[PDB]
Amino acid sequence: QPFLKDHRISTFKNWPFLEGCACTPERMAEAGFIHCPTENEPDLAQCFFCFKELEGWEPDDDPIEEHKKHSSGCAFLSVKKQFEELTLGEFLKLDRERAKNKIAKETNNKKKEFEETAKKVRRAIEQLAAM
């Protein structure tokens, strides 16, 4: 479903950078991107495949260029065929890589939230250490 450029392109119905820019909904959706606007970062877009999240876009940001630059190890980036031209096998291996990519982003978020808490814990324990 998200593998379809057209499921993706439909998420940008309120995306700022339109015709005239480089990160147009089309060049974005074609680069694996999906529009995930939060109240504070309304231009936040996320790769449907590697789940990296990029904000603060700029009129001449190349969705593909930014993609390679921040998530170089993304498999979707290396797919050179059109979608319909993927073997069922290729599509399975792609979809399995994706599940692995979702497990990874989640782990990162779990570890990140954990370190944020631990630092706050370590710091309060230092205070005691002094006395």
Binding site: E41, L44, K52, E53, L54, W57, E66
Partner: peptide, 4 residues
């Protein structure tokens, strides 16, 4: 763009 930058990392969120």
């Amino acid at each position: 763009a930058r990392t969120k």
